[PDB]
Amino acid sequence: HQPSTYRLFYALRVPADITAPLAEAQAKLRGNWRAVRPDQMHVTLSYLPAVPPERVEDLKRLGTRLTQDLPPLHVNLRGTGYFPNEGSPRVWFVKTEAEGLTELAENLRAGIRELGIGTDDLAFKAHITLARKKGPAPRLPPLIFDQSWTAPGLTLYRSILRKTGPIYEVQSTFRFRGSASQ
Numbered sequence: 001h002q003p004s005t006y007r008l009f010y011a012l013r014v015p016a017d018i019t020a021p022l023a024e025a026q027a028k029l030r031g032n033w034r035a036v037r038p039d040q041m042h043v044t045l046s047y048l049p050a051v052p053p054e055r056v057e058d059l060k061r062l063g064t065r066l067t068q069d070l071p072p073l074h075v076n077l078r079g080t081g082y083f084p085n086e087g088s089p090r091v092w093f094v095k096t097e098a099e100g101l102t103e104l105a106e107n108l109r110a111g112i113r114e115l116g117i118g119t120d121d122l123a124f125k126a127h128i129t130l131a132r133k134k135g136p137a138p139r140l141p142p143l144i145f146d147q148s149w150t151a152p153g154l155t156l157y158r159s160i161l162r163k164t165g166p167i168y169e170v171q172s173t174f175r176f177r178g179s180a181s182q
Contacts, residue, residue: 005050007159008171010063010108011042012075012151014128021147022094025080026130031137033092040168041128043075043096045105045154046112049120056171062111063156063174066104070176072152073098077145080130092140093127099180101126104154152176 014022019038026035051059075098082089105124112119153175157168 003052005052006048006056008048008051008056008059009157009159010045011155011157012045012073013155014038014041014043015149018077018147018149021145022077022128022130025094025143025145028140029092029131029137032133032135033131033137033140034133035131036129037165040165041130042155042157042168043101043126043128045101045124046109047120048112048117051117055115055117058115059112059117059156060172060174062108062115063154063172066107066111067154067174067176067178069178070100070104071178071180072150072176073100073104074148075101075151076148077128079144080140080142081127088136089139090132090134091129092131093129094143094145096126096128098126098151 016038019041022041023035023038029035048059075096078095078097080092080094083091083093102124105126109119109121109124153173155173156171158171159166159168161167
């Protein structure tokens with residue numbers, strides 16, 4: 001076997017006042033849809049499938065540097081949608097929007113690449129995944145949300161696989177220490 005690696009990802013945590021209405025939307029799921037647990041809900045910015053543990057400190061330094069001059073981000077829930085855009089949906093999600101969020105994700109992805117650490121990302125489209133499936137299920141009706149929250153920091157998570165599903169462990173958090181007026 002080769003040296004062990006970690007599955008890591010940078011994400012925004014989703015607070016209780018947001019996971020609760022999202023979970024209420026999941027009551028509509030039927031069939032082969034598998035709901036994401038509220039504890040598992042997050043806004044992923046980059047996924048790193050195989051990080052050698054000796055590289056984690058570089059990733060922590062990158063998280064601190066990129067968040068130092070941003071204010072806490074104001075994240076808005078928008079409407080629901082599916083991945084893939086193609087006919088059979090595998091993922092149901094809610095779109096999220098925030099000033100600065102695309103720029104943060106793209107700077108993060110560039111910084112990770114600069115470090116020579118591997119990513120496994122698709123084009124960035126900020127969202128919270130609500131459900132996954134394989135195979136047929138009744139499609140959900142379109143929903144929209146009006147809730148928002150203020151994200152105080154960016155989190156680096158490690159994913160560990162379990163029978164129930166993946167479990168996420170916080171590795172480090174990086175506070176947004178900046179302002180949008182100074």
